Design a protein around this ligand. Structure first.
Ligand code: ZN
Length: 168
């Protein structure tokens, strides 16, 4: 798989100066480094298809890991759910693979699944700052994969903007 650190460094535990700086800089957070270990482990052992994918900056919020990726032409959406459960056993936290997307409506549909989303509103302040609102049926709120405020923080981090959930 394509990643932001050296395979040797990640698997070694011993970082070259270049990788170590990335971790100090914060570009590869510490929990991201653990993912990279378990990811490379999980492709040598279990998923040759992983080597076609691409790692992307990933976020952690509370008990939840959100992994952003680009799936290679080898990676079944099923296999990603398989990869998620693999990660969720090696690491303690819950794992959610989201494929990297540039619209906020795409990544909100993926995360909030199994719940279904009603719609997404963009809004532009007089400031010009853009905010987003993901509408969900009251029924669906019971199907959210994590409490609504953690999903809000998650979505807000990924797209570096304000994201809010309206249970209407
Ligand atoms: Zn290195």
């Amino acid at each position: 798989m394509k990643i932001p650190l050296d395979y040797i460094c990640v698997k070694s535990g011993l970082l070259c100066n270049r990788c170590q700086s990335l971790v100090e800089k914060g570009e590869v957070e510490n929990f991201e480094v653990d993912l990279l270990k378990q990811l490379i482990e999980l492709e040598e052992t279990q998923f040759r298809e992983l080597k076609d994918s691409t790692y992307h900056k990933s976020y952690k919020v509370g008990n939840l890991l959100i992994l952003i990726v680009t799936s290679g032409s080898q990676m079944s959406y099923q296999k990603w759910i398989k990869v998620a459960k693999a990660l969720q056993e090696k690491i303690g936290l819950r794992v959610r693979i989201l494929e990297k997307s540039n619209s906020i409506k795409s990544t909100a549909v993926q995360l909030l699944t199994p719940a279904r989303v009603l719609g997404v509103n963009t809004v532009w302040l007089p400031d010009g700052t853009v905010q987003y609102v993901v509408r969900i049926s009251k029924q669906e709120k019971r199907f959210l994969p994590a409490d609504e405020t953690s999903l809000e923080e998650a979505l807000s981090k990924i797209h570096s903007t304000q994201v809010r959930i309206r249970v209407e």
